[PDB]
Design a protein around this ligand. Structure first.
Ligand SMILES: [Ca+2]
Length: 223
């Protein structure tokens, strides 16, 4: 996250870190057994880390649970990142408490200008790289489809939203991949892609979670 703030400890209790030796992606807990992330975060072996704040230090509230099922959207397009969504079934249910909690799926799509919270352990610099120990937070609004398409001509499908600032300076970035955009208590976006980070007129692009509620529910129901 570039231009954000350090989140207060466990203030994003649905935020998880996907680990394959080190942190490589975020994700969001949506029930005690299921995490949603980005399909471009796919790896064949993943440990889900819940209750994290400082990802480099054992603080006592962590739950480390292996990914058992790893299911990318069947229509995920690796070239365009259309349908960039992935579900992970934990090998054991997470123990839900105040520091490890689910976030609701959307009951409807978020309107442009809706304020949201983006979070993750990704790069905090728009030039170069700095990867934080502490979870980072950013308040950012949903942008209109026309503004998102003007930012990225010929690449914004109906399954993508832009969230952020056309003036740049504040954005998700590499390593935030797969993490949450939550608006009014609902997971509306998944960190998907962009042109660099926090550049002028290149806000981050996020998977439009509201398009996938039925796919998510059916996948969980069937697995
Ligand atoms: Ca730890």
């Amino acid at each position: 996250i570039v231009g954000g703030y350090t989140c207060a400890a466990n203030s994003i209790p649905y935020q998880v870190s996907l680990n394959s030796g080190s942190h490589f992606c975020g994700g969001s807990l949506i029930n005690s057994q299921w995490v949603v992330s980005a399909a471009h975060c796919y790896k064949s072996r993943i440990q889900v880390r819940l209750g994290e704040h400082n990802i480099d230090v054992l603080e006592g509230n962590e739950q480390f649970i292996n990914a058992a099922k790893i299911i990318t959207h069947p229509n995920f397009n690796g070239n365009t990142l259309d349908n960039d969504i992935m579900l992970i079934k934990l090998s054991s249910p997470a123990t839900l408490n105040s520091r490890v909690a689910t976030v609701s799926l959307p009951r409807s799509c978020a309107a442009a200008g809706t304020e949201c919270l983006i979070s993750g352990w990704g790069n905090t610099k728009s030039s170069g790289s700095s990867y934080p120990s502490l979870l980072q937070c950013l308040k950012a609004p949903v942008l209109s489809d026309s503004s998102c398409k003007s930012s990225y001509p010929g690449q914004i499908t109906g399954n993508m939203i832009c969230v952020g600032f056309l003036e740049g300076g504040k954005d998700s970035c590499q390593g935030d991949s797969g993490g949450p955009v939550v608006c009014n208590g609902q997971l509306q976006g998944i960190v998907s892609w962009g042109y660099g980070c926090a550049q002028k007129n290149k806000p981050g692009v996020y998977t439009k979670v509201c398009n996938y509620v039925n796919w998510i529910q059916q996948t969980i129901a069937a697995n």
